[PDB]
Amino acid sequence: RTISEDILFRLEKFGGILINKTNFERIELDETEAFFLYLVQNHGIEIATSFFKKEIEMGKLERALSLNIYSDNPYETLQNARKHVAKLKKHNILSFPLELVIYPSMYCDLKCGFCFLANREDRNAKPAKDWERILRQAKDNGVLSVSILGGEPTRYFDIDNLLIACEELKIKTTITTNAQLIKKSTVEILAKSKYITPVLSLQTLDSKLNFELMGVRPDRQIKLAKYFNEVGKKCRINAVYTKQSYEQIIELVDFCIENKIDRFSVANYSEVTGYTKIKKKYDLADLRRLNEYVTDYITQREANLNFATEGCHLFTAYPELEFSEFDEMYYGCRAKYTKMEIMSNGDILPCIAFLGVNQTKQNAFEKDLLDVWYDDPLYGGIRSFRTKNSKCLSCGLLKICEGGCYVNLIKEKSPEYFRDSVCQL
């Protein structure tokens, strides 16, 4: 009798953290409860119940015992947990990323005008065996989910094996695809997968506009969504808000409903100078007005569709706004504590935005992900950045924002004083 496989437990500098690996609801734990549950994980609830005897009689474990997180040398493990919690404190960082992002291949078969990762160099793409080692560290270190991107990942030669490794390691994984040339075998590995969920890149059902945006008709993305619904497999649609009208968005919502799409995400359009070709039409305010339009539509028709907008600093469109020790590191720029991205050559980046930063990056094929997660200059830089902008210093969201996206700030003359134009508050 231990902790459920559907529950993610990790020791943190403030105790511990529990998260459902399917519901995504989370609970912050004491140091007592975290040490308690750590034993309950590495030993039985009995061996754990032995320790903390006084605490259980003091009522200090009334909550931790009142949870539904259970399923079917403790001195040295309790000591090592203490050695761990102390190290996290002396670094003041999250234990491990909750999100790992991997780019097994930068090659893609398309050249979407809105994309910033097209035509990239894809020379010596490592095989799934090498990524398997990386995946094992992530699993063993407490990662919550592994997102497979690119590039078109389905055009990655060893994609089938890589997907198998994620299924065998039982890591909550997603793969995002244009669905153009996806192999039959691959579609099967996804159809009979319990842990992997496909995401389909689809800008619209309108053939012309989608062809202008991606350079293909939406036919194959539509076909695959329809197919997964047949074999009863969870599927998702991801679109970038670039040129779509409201009417075209709603048309795409209805498609998700009819075909029972798990989640429909509309990402904010991020311009990257020198790479993105299309001009940005809508800001974050326009994205909020859209979100409040779609949710008002999905509910005004009684649909169980899981809708969302995505991007950084989306909160800057809400002027209507004390964070917990975890929330301070969870909300806002994920590149600080909750995210890691691994390039095709093994380059480790806090964020994909660091592709254009000409600083040195460590290799995930030579070094360990946890070492880098502790001692890496790029992480230290973004983590330790503090803005001196007057508006920001008096802003309620300073702790999670720090004057905007760090990667943009360090490009400016006086980054500590420059506020990101995305915020006009």
Ligand X SMILES: C[S@@+](CC[C@H](N)C(=O)[O-])C[C@H]1O[C@@H](n2cnc3c(N)ncnc32)[C@H](O)[C@@H]1O
Q: Are 167 and 194 in contact (CB under 8 A)?
A: yes
Taking the least distance from each CB to ligand SF4, the nearer of 205 and 278 is: 278
From CA 242, how far away is CA 219, in angstroms rounded? 20
Number of residues that bind ligand SF4 (CB under 6 A): 35
* 179 near ligand SF4, rule: CB under 6 A: no
Q: Are 372 and 97 in contact (CB under 8 A)?
A: no
Q: Are 270 and 283 in contact (CB under 8 A)?
A: no
From CA 243, how far away is CA 370, in angstroms rounded? 41
Output the smallest distance, CB 154 to ligand SF4, in A. 10
Q: Would you tell me which residues interact with ligand X (CB under 6 A)?
A: 108, 114-117, 149-152, 176-178, 201, 238, 240, 267, 269-270, 276
* CA proximity to 101, closest of 140, 135, 141: 135
**Residue 398 binding result from ligand SF4, ligand X, none, given CB thresholds of 5 to 8 Å by partner type:** ligand SF4
Window 276-315: residues binding ligand SF4 (CB under 6 A): 312
H or E element: which one contains 349?
Answer: strand 348-349
Residues 6+ apart with CB under 8 A from 168: none
Candidates 32-40, 78-86, 144-152, 221-229 — which segment interacts with ligand SF4 by CB under 6 A?
144-152
**Does residue 66 have a known ligand-binding role?**
no
Q: For ligand SF4, which residue of 335, 349, 364, 372 counts as binding (CB under 6 A)?
A: 335
DSSP state string for 18-75? EEETTT--EEEE-HHHHHHHHHHHHS-HHHHHHTTHHHHHHTTTTTGGG-S-EE--HH
Distances (CA, A) of 303 to 112, 248, 299, 306: 31, 18, 6, 9
Output the smallest distance, CB 282 to ligand SF4, in A. 18
Residue stretches of the annotated binding site: 108, 112, 114-116, 152, 201, 203, 238, 270, 312, 333, 351, 392, 395, 401, 405, 423
Residue stretches of the annotated binding site for [4Fe-4S] cluster: 108, 112, 115, 312, 333, 351, 392, 395, 401, 405, 423
Q: Which residues bind ligand SF4 (CB under 6 A)?
A: 108, 110-112, 115, 117-118, 150-152, 178, 201, 214, 312, 316, 333-335, 351, 353, 391-392, 395, 397-398, 401, 403-407, 419-420, 423, 425
